[PDB]
Amino acid sequence: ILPDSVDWREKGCVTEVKYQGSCGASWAFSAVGALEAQLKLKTGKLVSLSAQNLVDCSTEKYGNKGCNGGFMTTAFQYIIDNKGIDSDASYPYKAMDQKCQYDSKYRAATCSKYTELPYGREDVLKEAVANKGPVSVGVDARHPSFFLYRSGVYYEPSCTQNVNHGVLVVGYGDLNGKEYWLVKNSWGHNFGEEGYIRMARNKGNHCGIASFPSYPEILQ
Ligand SMILES: CC(C)(C)C1CCN(CCCn2nc(-c3ccc(C(F)(F)F)c(CNCc4ccc(F)cc4)c3)c3c2CCN(S(C)(=O)=O)C3)CC1
């Protein structure tokens, strides 16, 4: 059976909320966020990974268009093919498309593999958050209510299962009967609950939370 709540921030596996700005790089933040937890698990050290490095280098070959959109899965592939990703401190985020500046001497993480989960299976997503770590997902964030969210379990009746915004599920729980997912966003600390949104869980793949989940792995 499975725990009723998880919160990977309680285990020191989640870095500070980031601020993506004008650049549509939510997918890159989603991807490094998921790897950051796998890295802390392996090495005991928590270090922010370079979303910029994903924006600049995981490009045409991986189906990504930097600040105009991308995929977490093909971001994980880039890190696999590239044999590393830099630390955020060495390759800081600039919220704009740049030429690729990966330097292997400031390699902060590796990626061995990644796994995609079945569309719409929130029980499968729940198991992965418990047993594997935080999971990269997309959500439907194209609703005034999403931007305006300040607290509580977010439920948007007009939300769809088509995803357009990359985020990280770092836990799940329940708030007085309302089951939720704990979601790390990349809109700074002034968004929602210090940068987190708790989204409706077990409500028919609400906002496409479980439409396209994936999580990376660092072996050995
Ligand atoms: C590259 C390769 C090998 C051919 C892959 C083929 C498999 N796969 C595509 C299909 C799976 N998939 N993945 C996503 C998916 C997952 C996460 C996210 C994110 F929000 F987190 F960012 C997004 C949003 N960004 C889209 C974006 C991508 C590149 C760009 F430039 C510009 C924008 C989409 C979707 C689908 C299906 C269609 N939809 S939809 C409306 O929801 O049905 C979305 C990824 C590419």
Curated annotation (Swiss-Prot):
Keyword Aminoacyl-tRNA synthetase (UniProt): no
GO biological process: adaptive immune response; antigen processing and presentation; antigen processing and presentation of exogenous peptide antigen via MHC class II; antigen processing and presentation of peptide antigen; basement membrane disassembly; cellular response to thyroid hormone stimulus; collagen catabolic process; extracellular matrix disassembly
Catalytic activity: Similar to cathepsin L, but with much less activity on Z-Phe-Arg-|-NHMec, and more activity on the Z-Val-Val-Arg-|-Xaa compound
A molecular function GO annotation: cysteine-type endopeptidase activity
Keyword set, alphabetical order: Cytoplasmic vesicle, Disulfide bond, Glycoprotein, Hydrolase, Lysosome, Protease, Secreted, Signal, Thiol protease, Zymogen
EC numbers on record: 3.4.22.27
Residues the record marks as active site: 26, 165, 185
Enzyme class: hydrolase
Entry's Gene Ontology cellular component terms: collagen-containing extracellular matrix; endolysosome lumen; extracellular region; extracellular space; ficolin-1-rich granule lumen; intracellular membrane-bounded organelle; late endosome; lysosomal lumen
Compartments where located: Lysosome; Secreted; Cytoplasmic vesicle, Phagosome
Disulfide bonds: 13-111, 23-67, 57-100, 159-207
Major subcellular site: other
Subunit structure: Monomer.
Family recorded in the similarity comment: Belongs to the peptidase C1 family.
Protein role: Thiol protease. Key protease responsible for the removal of the invariant chain from MHC class II molecules and MHC class II antigen presentation. The bond-specificity of this proteinase is in part similar to the specificities of cathepsin L.
Protein name per UniProt: Cathepsin S
Source organism of this protein record: Homo sapiens (Human)
Top-level taxonomy: Eukaryota, Metazoa, Chordata, Craniata, Vertebrata
Gene: CTSS
Included range, full protein: 114 to 331 of 331
